[PDB]
mmCIF file of C-alpha atoms in Angstrom:
data_model
loop_
_atom_site.group_PDB
_atom_site.id
_atom_site.type_symbol
_atom_site.label_atom_id
_atom_site.label_comp_id
_atom_site.label_asym_id
_atom_site.label_seq_id
_atom_site.Cartn_x
_atom_site.Cartn_y
_atom_site.Cartn_z
ATOM 1 C CA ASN V 1 -106.157 -120.259 -84.500
ATOM 2 C CA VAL V 2 -106.444 -117.453 -87.090
ATOM 3 C CA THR V 3 -106.279 -113.624 -86.973
ATOM 4 C CA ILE V 4 -106.749 -110.680 -89.258
ATOM 5 C CA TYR V 5 -102.935 -110.656 -89.207
ATOM 6 C CA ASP V 6 -102.794 -114.247 -90.455
ATOM 7 C CA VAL V 7 -105.123 -113.400 -93.324
ATOM 8 C CA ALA V 8 -103.359 -110.181 -94.389
ATOM 9 C CA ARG V 9 -100.018 -111.961 -94.592
ATOM 10 C CA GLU V 10 -101.634 -114.781 -96.611
ATOM 11 C CA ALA V 11 -103.396 -112.525 -99.119
ATOM 12 C CA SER V 12 -100.455 -110.090 -99.159
ATOM 13 C CA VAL V 13 -102.361 -107.040 -97.971
ATOM 14 C CA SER V 14 -102.429 -105.022 -94.767
ATOM 15 C CA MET V 15 -104.609 -105.786 -91.710
ATOM 16 C CA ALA V 16 -106.482 -102.608 -92.499
ATOM 17 C CA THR V 17 -107.414 -103.991 -95.925
ATOM 18 C CA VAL V 18 -108.583 -107.318 -94.532
ATOM 19 C CA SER V 19 -110.813 -105.310 -92.209
ATOM 20 C CA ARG V 20 -111.918 -103.129 -95.023
ATOM 21 C CA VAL V 21 -113.065 -106.273 -96.739
ATOM 22 C CA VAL V 22 -114.474 -107.779 -93.530
ATOM 23 C CA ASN V 23 -116.519 -104.580 -93.017
ATOM 24 C CA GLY V 24 -117.772 -104.765 -96.579
ATOM 25 C CA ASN V 25 -116.015 -101.555 -97.632
ATOM 26 C CA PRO V 26 -117.297 -100.902 -101.164
ATOM 27 C CA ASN V 27 -114.233 -99.201 -102.686
ATOM 28 C CA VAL V 28 -111.918 -102.120 -102.289
ATOM 29 C CA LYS V 29 -110.676 -103.218 -105.697
ATOM 30 C CA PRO V 30 -112.805 -106.297 -106.205
ATOM 31 C CA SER V 31 -109.794 -108.401 -107.199
ATOM 32 C CA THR V 32 -108.452 -107.545 -103.779
ATOM 33 C CA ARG V 33 -111.783 -108.366 -102.127
ATOM 34 C CA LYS V 34 -111.842 -111.594 -104.072
ATOM 35 C CA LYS V 35 -108.449 -112.765 -102.940
ATOM 36 C CA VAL V 36 -109.062 -111.620 -99.383
ATOM 37 C CA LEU V 37 -112.378 -113.485 -99.302
ATOM 38 C CA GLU V 38 -110.842 -116.715 -100.564
ATOM 39 C CA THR V 39 -108.040 -116.464 -98.031
ATOM 40 C CA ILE V 40 -110.651 -115.935 -95.321
ATOM 41 C CA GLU V 41 -112.682 -118.920 -96.403
ATOM 42 C CA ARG V 42 -109.559 -120.939 -96.933
ATOM 43 C CA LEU V 43 -107.848 -120.277 -93.606
ATOM 44 C CA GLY V 44 -111.143 -120.482 -91.678
ATOM 45 C CA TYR V 45 -111.105 -116.930 -90.447
ATOM 46 C CA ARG V 46 -114.221 -115.721 -88.626
ATOM 47 C CA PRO V 47 -114.845 -112.023 -88.215
ATOM 48 C CA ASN V 48 -116.829 -112.590 -85.051
ATOM 49 C CA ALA V 49 -114.470 -112.611 -82.062
ATOM 50 C CA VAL V 50 -116.785 -114.556 -79.728
ATOM 51 C CA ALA V 51 -117.033 -117.275 -82.382
ATOM 52 C CA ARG V 52 -113.324 -116.955 -83.296
ATOM 53 C CA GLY V 53 -112.436 -117.453 -79.623
ATOM 54 C CA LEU V 54 -114.966 -120.280 -79.194
ATOM 55 C CA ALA V 55 -113.407 -122.335 -82.005
ATOM 56 C CA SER V 56 -109.971 -122.147 -80.386
ATOM 57 C CA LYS V 57 -108.790 -121.298 -76.840
ATOM 58 C CA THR V 58 -105.368 -125.089 -75.409
ATOM 59 C CA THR V 59 -101.767 -125.726 -74.376
ATOM 60 C CA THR V 60 -98.990 -125.808 -76.944
ATOM 61 C CA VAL V 61 -95.397 -126.992 -77.064
ATOM 62 C CA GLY V 62 -92.361 -125.921 -79.051
ATOM 63 C CA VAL V 63 -90.012 -128.619 -80.180
ATOM 64 C CA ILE V 64 -86.481 -127.725 -81.244
ATOM 65 C CA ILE V 65 -84.760 -130.540 -83.109
ATOM 66 C CA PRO V 66 -81.765 -130.888 -85.473
ATOM 67 C CA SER V 67 -84.953 -134.567 -88.407
ATOM 68 C CA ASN V 68 -83.272 -137.625 -89.898
ATOM 69 C CA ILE V 69 -84.574 -140.772 -88.117
ATOM 70 C CA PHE V 70 -83.657 -141.312 -84.504
ATOM 71 C CA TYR V 71 -84.883 -137.779 -84.354
ATOM 72 C CA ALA V 72 -88.112 -138.788 -86.089
ATOM 73 C CA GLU V 73 -89.018 -141.421 -83.488
ATOM 74 C CA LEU V 74 -88.353 -138.899 -80.757
ATOM 75 C CA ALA V 75 -90.800 -136.714 -82.591
ATOM 76 C CA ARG V 76 -93.373 -139.440 -82.984
ATOM 77 C CA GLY V 77 -93.070 -140.015 -79.275
ATOM 78 C CA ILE V 78 -93.768 -136.409 -78.443
ATOM 79 C CA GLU V 79 -96.453 -136.114 -81.094
ATOM 80 C CA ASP V 80 -98.194 -139.167 -79.746
ATOM 81 C CA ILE V 81 -98.516 -137.671 -76.252
ATOM 82 C CA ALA V 82 -99.550 -134.244 -77.551
ATOM 83 C CA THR V 83 -102.274 -136.054 -79.424
ATOM 84 C CA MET V 84 -103.957 -137.754 -76.507
ATOM 85 C CA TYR V 85 -103.114 -134.889 -74.186
ATOM 86 C CA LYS V 86 -104.857 -132.751 -76.841
ATOM 87 C CA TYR V 87 -101.876 -130.372 -76.955
ATOM 88 C CA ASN V 88 -100.135 -128.892 -79.944
ATOM 89 C CA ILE V 89 -96.697 -129.292 -81.422
ATOM 90 C CA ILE V 90 -94.541 -126.563 -82.893
ATOM 91 C CA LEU V 91 -91.730 -128.541 -84.470
ATOM 92 C CA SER V 92 -88.792 -126.885 -86.199
ATOM 93 C CA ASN V 93 -85.444 -128.093 -87.510
ATOM 94 C CA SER V 94 -82.419 -126.235 -86.196
ATOM 95 C CA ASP V 95 -78.782 -127.268 -86.466
ATOM 96 C CA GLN V 96 -76.384 -124.369 -86.074
ATOM 97 C CA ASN V 97 -76.234 -123.132 -82.504
ATOM 98 C CA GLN V 98 -77.130 -119.779 -84.104
ATOM 99 C CA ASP V 99 -80.219 -121.394 -85.670
ATOM 100 C CA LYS V 100 -80.709 -123.162 -82.298
ATOM 101 C CA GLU V 101 -80.792 -120.023 -80.129
ATOM 102 C CA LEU V 102 -83.062 -118.002 -82.427
ATOM 103 C CA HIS V 103 -85.687 -120.769 -82.475
ATOM 104 C CA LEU V 104 -85.494 -120.417 -78.676
ATOM 105 C CA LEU V 105 -86.107 -116.684 -78.379
ATOM 106 C CA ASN V 106 -88.177 -117.396 -81.526
ATOM 107 C CA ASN V 107 -91.054 -119.768 -80.705
ATOM 108 C CA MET V 108 -90.493 -118.331 -77.206
ATOM 109 C CA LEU V 109 -93.211 -115.925 -78.271
ATOM 110 C CA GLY V 110 -95.516 -118.955 -78.461
ATOM 111 C CA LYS V 111 -99.148 -119.121 -77.334
ATOM 112 C CA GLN V 112 -101.623 -120.500 -74.738
ATOM 113 C CA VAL V 113 -100.008 -122.277 -71.755
ATOM 114 C CA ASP V 114 -96.759 -123.045 -73.615
ATOM 115 C CA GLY V 115 -93.529 -124.943 -72.815
ATOM 116 C CA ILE V 116 -90.519 -126.298 -74.714
ATOM 117 C CA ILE V 117 -88.727 -129.569 -75.513
ATOM 118 C CA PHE V 118 -85.122 -129.085 -76.590
ATOM 119 C CA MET V 119 -82.664 -131.572 -78.097
ATOM 120 C CA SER V 120 -79.135 -130.714 -79.183
ATOM 121 C CA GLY V 121 -75.984 -132.821 -79.688
ATOM 122 C CA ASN V 122 -74.297 -130.684 -77.059
ATOM 123 C CA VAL V 123 -74.868 -127.675 -74.786
ATOM 124 C CA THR V 124 -74.172 -123.975 -75.201
ATOM 125 C CA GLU V 125 -73.645 -122.379 -71.749
ATOM 126 C CA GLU V 126 -75.405 -119.485 -73.437
ATOM 127 C CA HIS V 127 -78.139 -122.091 -73.901
ATOM 128 C CA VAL V 128 -78.198 -122.895 -70.166
ATOM 129 C CA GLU V 129 -78.929 -119.212 -69.512
ATOM 130 C CA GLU V 130 -81.613 -118.637 -72.204
ATOM 131 C CA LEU V 131 -83.541 -121.689 -71.055
ATOM 132 C CA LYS V 132 -83.505 -120.209 -67.541
ATOM 133 C CA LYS V 133 -84.890 -116.897 -68.872
ATOM 134 C CA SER V 134 -87.891 -118.273 -70.719
ATOM 135 C CA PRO V 135 -90.783 -118.281 -68.257
ATOM 136 C CA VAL V 136 -92.149 -121.554 -69.634
ATOM 137 C CA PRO V 137 -90.367 -124.712 -68.456
ATOM 138 C CA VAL V 138 -87.958 -126.529 -70.711
ATOM 139 C CA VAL V 139 -87.216 -130.213 -70.913
ATOM 140 C CA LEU V 140 -84.077 -131.605 -72.492
ATOM 141 C CA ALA V 141 -84.439 -134.739 -74.543
ATOM 142 C CA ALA V 142 -81.482 -137.016 -75.303
ATOM 143 C CA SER V 143 -79.354 -134.059 -74.230
ATOM 144 C CA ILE V 144 -77.357 -133.375 -71.085
ATOM 145 C CA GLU V 145 -75.578 -130.277 -69.764
ATOM 146 C CA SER V 146 -73.954 -131.006 -66.380
ATOM 147 C CA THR V 147 -76.184 -128.013 -65.947
ATOM 148 C CA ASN V 148 -78.510 -130.236 -63.941
ATOM 149 C CA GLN V 149 -81.006 -127.462 -63.323
ATOM 150 C CA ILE V 150 -82.492 -128.341 -66.664
ATOM 151 C CA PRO V 151 -84.856 -131.293 -66.530
ATOM 152 C CA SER V 152 -83.596 -133.956 -68.869
ATOM 153 C CA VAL V 153 -84.935 -137.222 -70.227
ATOM 154 C CA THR V 154 -82.211 -139.451 -71.603
ATOM 155 C CA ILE V 155 -80.519 -142.761 -71.222
ATOM 156 C CA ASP V 156 -77.723 -143.406 -68.806
ATOM 157 C CA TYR V 157 -74.785 -142.795 -71.124
ATOM 158 C CA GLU V 158 -72.176 -143.747 -68.581
ATOM 159 C CA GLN V 159 -73.773 -147.081 -67.879
ATOM 160 C CA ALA V 160 -74.443 -147.535 -71.635
ATOM 161 C CA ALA V 161 -70.731 -146.943 -72.297
ATOM 162 C CA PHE V 162 -69.943 -149.191 -69.400
ATOM 163 C CA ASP V 163 -72.275 -151.794 -70.919
ATOM 164 C CA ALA V 164 -70.753 -151.369 -74.394
ATOM 165 C CA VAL V 165 -67.321 -151.891 -72.959
ATOM 166 C CA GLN V 166 -68.371 -154.730 -70.703
ATOM 167 C CA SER V 167 -69.352 -156.825 -73.709
ATOM 168 C CA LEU V 168 -65.880 -156.409 -75.090
ATOM 169 C CA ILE V 169 -64.371 -157.556 -71.855
ATOM 170 C CA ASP V 170 -66.808 -160.479 -71.486
ATOM 171 C CA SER V 171 -65.413 -161.581 -74.800
ATOM 172 C CA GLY V 172 -61.757 -161.771 -73.799
ATOM 173 C CA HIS V 173 -60.319 -158.357 -74.693
ATOM 174 C CA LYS V 174 -57.794 -156.778 -72.433
ATOM 175 C CA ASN V 175 -56.737 -154.046 -74.815
ATOM 176 C CA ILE V 176 -59.769 -151.962 -75.602
ATOM 177 C CA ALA V 177 -59.817 -148.395 -76.787
ATOM 178 C CA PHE V 178 -62.367 -145.655 -77.055
ATOM 179 C CA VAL V 179 -62.950 -143.305 -79.943
ATOM 180 C CA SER V 180 -64.790 -140.295 -78.775
ATOM 181 C CA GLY V 181 -66.606 -137.313 -80.124
ATOM 182 C CA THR V 182 -65.201 -133.963 -79.034
ATOM 183 C CA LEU V 183 -64.244 -134.507 -75.377
ATOM 184 C CA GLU V 184 -65.279 -130.976 -74.437
ATOM 185 C CA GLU V 185 -68.873 -132.220 -74.660
ATOM 186 C CA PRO V 186 -70.181 -133.825 -71.437
ATOM 187 C CA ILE V 187 -71.686 -136.879 -73.231
ATOM 188 C CA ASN V 188 -68.028 -137.591 -73.849
ATOM 189 C CA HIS V 189 -65.680 -136.332 -71.116
ATOM 190 C CA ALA V 190 -68.209 -136.918 -68.357
ATOM 191 C CA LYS V 191 -70.194 -140.037 -69.421
ATOM 192 C CA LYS V 192 -68.989 -142.405 -72.103
ATOM 193 C CA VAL V 193 -65.399 -141.754 -71.041
ATOM 194 C CA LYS V 194 -66.271 -142.482 -67.357
ATOM 195 C CA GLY V 195 -68.299 -145.585 -68.282
ATOM 196 C CA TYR V 196 -65.438 -146.697 -70.466
ATOM 197 C CA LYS V 197 -62.855 -146.128 -67.777
ATOM 198 C CA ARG V 198 -65.078 -147.814 -65.167
ATOM 199 C CA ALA V 199 -65.692 -150.826 -67.350
ATOM 200 C CA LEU V 200 -61.908 -151.120 -67.545
ATOM 201 C CA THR V 201 -61.272 -150.448 -63.869
ATOM 202 C CA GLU V 202 -63.907 -152.860 -62.498
ATOM 203 C CA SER V 203 -62.189 -155.716 -64.270
ATOM 204 C CA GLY V 204 -58.794 -154.466 -63.281
ATOM 205 C CA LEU V 205 -57.792 -153.360 -66.718
ATOM 206 C CA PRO V 206 -55.202 -150.742 -67.705
ATOM 207 C CA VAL V 207 -56.620 -147.344 -68.534
ATOM 208 C CA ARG V 208 -54.068 -145.939 -71.066
ATOM 209 C CA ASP V 209 -54.396 -142.325 -72.177
ATOM 210 C CA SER V 210 -53.386 -143.379 -75.673
ATOM 211 C CA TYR V 211 -56.331 -145.751 -75.955
ATOM 212 C CA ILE V 212 -58.536 -142.712 -75.917
ATOM 213 C CA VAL V 213 -58.631 -140.968 -79.298
ATOM 214 C CA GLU V 214 -60.703 -137.878 -79.962
ATOM 215 C CA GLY V 215 -62.639 -137.589 -83.232
ATOM 216 C CA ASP V 216 -64.921 -134.787 -84.493
ATOM 217 C CA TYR V 217 -67.975 -136.892 -85.208
ATOM 218 C CA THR V 218 -67.117 -137.548 -88.851
ATOM 219 C CA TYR V 219 -66.541 -140.698 -90.693
ATOM 220 C CA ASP V 220 -62.964 -139.673 -91.379
ATOM 221 C CA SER V 221 -61.859 -138.806 -87.884
ATOM 222 C CA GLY V 222 -63.190 -142.281 -87.337
ATOM 223 C CA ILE V 223 -60.730 -143.440 -89.989
ATOM 224 C CA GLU V 224 -57.903 -141.294 -88.634
ATOM 225 C CA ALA V 225 -58.416 -142.592 -85.098
ATOM 226 C CA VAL V 226 -58.024 -146.235 -86.153
ATOM 227 C CA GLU V 227 -54.813 -145.299 -87.942
ATOM 228 C CA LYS V 228 -53.587 -143.884 -84.625
ATOM 229 C CA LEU V 229 -54.655 -146.781 -82.445
ATOM 230 C CA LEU V 230 -53.283 -149.231 -84.913
ATOM 231 C CA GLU V 231 -49.917 -147.591 -84.503
ATOM 232 C CA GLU V 232 -49.822 -148.226 -80.774
ATOM 233 C CA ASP V 233 -47.193 -150.649 -79.590
ATOM 234 C CA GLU V 234 -49.586 -153.246 -78.233
ATOM 235 C CA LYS V 235 -52.608 -152.602 -80.421
ATOM 236 C CA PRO V 236 -56.213 -152.662 -79.172
ATOM 237 C CA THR V 237 -58.173 -155.747 -80.186
ATOM 238 C CA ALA V 238 -61.407 -153.937 -79.639
ATOM 239 C CA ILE V 239 -62.647 -150.414 -79.851
ATOM 240 C CA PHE V 240 -65.663 -148.658 -78.509
ATOM 241 C CA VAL V 241 -66.742 -145.724 -80.624
ATOM 242 C CA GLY V 242 -68.784 -142.868 -79.361
ATOM 243 C CA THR V 243 -71.099 -142.659 -82.341
ATOM 244 C CA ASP V 244 -71.944 -144.848 -85.345
ATOM 245 C CA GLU V 245 -70.699 -142.476 -87.986
ATOM 246 C CA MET V 246 -67.204 -142.468 -86.619
ATOM 247 C CA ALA V 247 -67.380 -146.174 -86.119
ATOM 248 C CA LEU V 248 -68.004 -146.813 -89.802
ATOM 249 C CA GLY V 249 -64.702 -145.012 -90.206
ATOM 250 C CA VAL V 250 -63.054 -147.272 -87.655
ATOM 251 C CA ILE V 251 -64.290 -150.480 -89.239
ATOM 252 C CA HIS V 252 -63.161 -149.241 -92.642
ATOM 253 C CA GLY V 253 -59.734 -148.082 -91.597
ATOM 254 C CA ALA V 254 -59.103 -151.524 -90.107
ATOM 255 C CA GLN V 255 -60.403 -153.230 -93.134
ATOM 256 C CA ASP V 256 -58.058 -150.993 -95.100
ATOM 257 C CA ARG V 257 -55.167 -152.132 -92.834
ATOM 258 C CA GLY V 258 -56.020 -155.730 -93.688
ATOM 259 C CA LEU V 259 -57.787 -156.442 -90.347
ATOM 260 C CA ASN V 260 -60.965 -158.542 -90.145
ATOM 261 C CA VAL V 261 -63.213 -156.571 -87.924
ATOM 262 C CA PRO V 262 -64.934 -159.170 -85.772
ATOM 263 C CA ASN V 263 -61.883 -161.426 -85.939
ATOM 264 C CA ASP V 264 -58.984 -159.037 -85.637
ATOM 265 C CA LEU V 265 -60.799 -156.198 -83.990
ATOM 266 C CA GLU V 266 -64.210 -155.952 -82.418
ATOM 267 C CA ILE V 267 -66.087 -152.757 -82.685
ATOM 268 C CA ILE V 268 -69.137 -151.281 -81.046
ATOM 269 C CA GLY V 269 -70.760 -147.893 -81.574
ATOM 270 C CA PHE V 270 -73.477 -145.720 -80.269
ATOM 271 C CA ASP V 271 -76.891 -144.645 -81.172
ATOM 272 C CA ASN V 272 -78.461 -147.133 -83.551
ATOM 273 C CA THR V 273 -78.352 -144.990 -86.667
ATOM 274 C CA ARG V 274 -79.299 -146.062 -90.173
ATOM 275 C CA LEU V 275 -75.569 -146.280 -90.797
ATOM 276 C CA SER V 276 -75.061 -149.040 -88.219
ATOM 277 C CA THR V 277 -76.836 -151.274 -90.714
ATOM 278 C CA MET V 278 -75.088 -149.782 -93.709
ATOM 279 C CA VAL V 279 -71.528 -151.242 -93.163
ATOM 280 C CA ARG V 280 -70.680 -154.794 -93.593
ATOM 281 C CA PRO V 281 -69.517 -156.193 -90.398
ATOM 282 C CA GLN V 282 -72.822 -154.618 -89.240
ATOM 283 C CA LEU V 283 -72.055 -152.421 -86.283
ATOM 284 C CA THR V 284 -73.313 -153.695 -82.949
ATOM 285 C CA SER V 285 -74.410 -150.562 -81.291
ATOM 286 C CA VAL V 286 -76.227 -148.954 -78.488
ATOM 287 C CA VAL V 287 -79.916 -148.364 -78.877
ATOM 288 C CA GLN V 288 -81.524 -145.456 -77.159
ATOM 289 C CA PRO V 289 -85.293 -145.669 -76.849
ATOM 290 C CA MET V 290 -86.053 -142.378 -78.563
ATOM 291 C CA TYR V 291 -89.748 -142.779 -78.918
ATOM 292 C CA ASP V 292 -89.938 -143.247 -75.144
ATOM 293 C CA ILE V 293 -87.479 -140.473 -74.464
ATOM 294 C CA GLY V 294 -89.682 -138.028 -76.321
ATOM 295 C CA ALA V 295 -92.825 -139.466 -74.791
ATOM 296 C CA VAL V 296 -91.477 -139.397 -71.236
ATOM 297 C CA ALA V 297 -90.084 -135.973 -72.054
ATOM 298 C CA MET V 298 -93.461 -134.657 -73.122
ATOM 299 C CA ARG V 299 -94.973 -136.024 -69.949
ATOM 300 C CA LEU V 300 -92.226 -134.472 -67.847
ATOM 301 C CA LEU V 301 -92.630 -131.054 -69.344
ATOM 302 C CA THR V 302 -96.350 -131.520 -68.696
ATOM 303 C CA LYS V 303 -95.917 -132.173 -64.964
ATOM 304 C CA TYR V 304 -94.028 -128.857 -64.904
ATOM 305 C CA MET V 305 -96.433 -126.853 -67.004
ATOM 306 C CA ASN V 306 -99.047 -128.140 -64.515
ATOM 307 C CA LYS V 307 -96.721 -127.627 -61.518
ATOM 308 C CA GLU V 308 -96.298 -130.922 -59.642
ATOM 309 C CA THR V 309 -93.872 -133.155 -57.802
ATOM 310 C CA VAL V 310 -91.620 -136.125 -58.754
ATOM 311 C CA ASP V 311 -87.892 -136.009 -59.658
ATOM 312 C CA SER V 312 -86.761 -134.204 -62.841
ATOM 313 C CA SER V 313 -83.381 -133.987 -64.526
ATOM 314 C CA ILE V 314 -82.351 -137.477 -63.431
ATOM 315 C CA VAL V 315 -84.860 -139.223 -65.718
ATOM 316 C CA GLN V 316 -82.868 -142.018 -67.257
ATOM 317 C CA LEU V 317 -84.598 -144.626 -69.343
ATOM 318 C CA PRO V 318 -82.913 -147.848 -70.151
ATOM 319 C CA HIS V 319 -80.895 -148.563 -73.250
ATOM 320 C CA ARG V 320 -79.954 -151.827 -74.841
ATOM 321 C CA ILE V 321 -77.377 -153.014 -77.266
ATOM 322 C CA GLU V 322 -78.099 -154.414 -80.693
ATOM 323 C CA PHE V 323 -75.499 -157.051 -81.179
ATOM 324 C CA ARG V 324 -74.685 -157.358 -84.827
ATOM 325 C CA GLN V 325 -71.617 -158.604 -86.600
ATOM 326 C CA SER V 326 -68.915 -156.136 -85.597
ATOM 327 C CA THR V 327 -68.671 -157.929 -82.275
ATOM 328 C CA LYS V 328 -68.035 -161.697 -82.200
#
């Protein structure tokens, strides 16, 4: 676990000075000795290599993650398998794709065995090519790429969309819109949009291009997008929304236009964020099983880092929908 280097950093001296103190050099300022000795005791540094190696090794895993809540459960899920697998977790918050890609080349100088679990809200194509570099195998969690060379553990977004929209239809709505995150992202253009379309097709419903409004993942775009849809000639009576945060906007814009949300306009969102229970018509919304996704992820990774069979990439766990008050 612990090197000369670790000690020298911690006591703010050079490696050569930690050795000097390890070797009992007598002309080391004794304040220096003192601090270097306490750092040694404190960190648990042994000067004997055969002992230092004996206390250590064991198979470790980097985890790159944006950590509010639905992120936390994904963590717990990973942590819980590391724990019984007796592996170790390097966790690290990264948000900016610049922060994201450093962490990659970053913990990429990891340690014994090694492998990496990655989760981002979308994919850099850069990202698809840095993953492929790293010798250690990478598993995507709650992240897709269309780059289906990267093993991924997620829900079925397209079916989850489909399922979100189906409940609207089962409830009598003909005129149902979608409010998406940035379409460029495959969660959107390639899944929730498909599932939304298909839900409409399979019940022989019109698939208007104007019922599909693109937001930016903020609460406002959410608000803007309702303004737009509410200006349509025949207005939607129900709206699927690609994330919760935008959906709070959509409920609120409607409530600002005098519309009762269940009664004039049913709304459903995605992920089951803290916010879904922080609006008043409480947002019925799609629950990913994030604990499982991180667990199953960690296992997947493991079956790679050990080199074995089974199907990757297409690991899709089930989702469900928490029906709350923003549907009838």
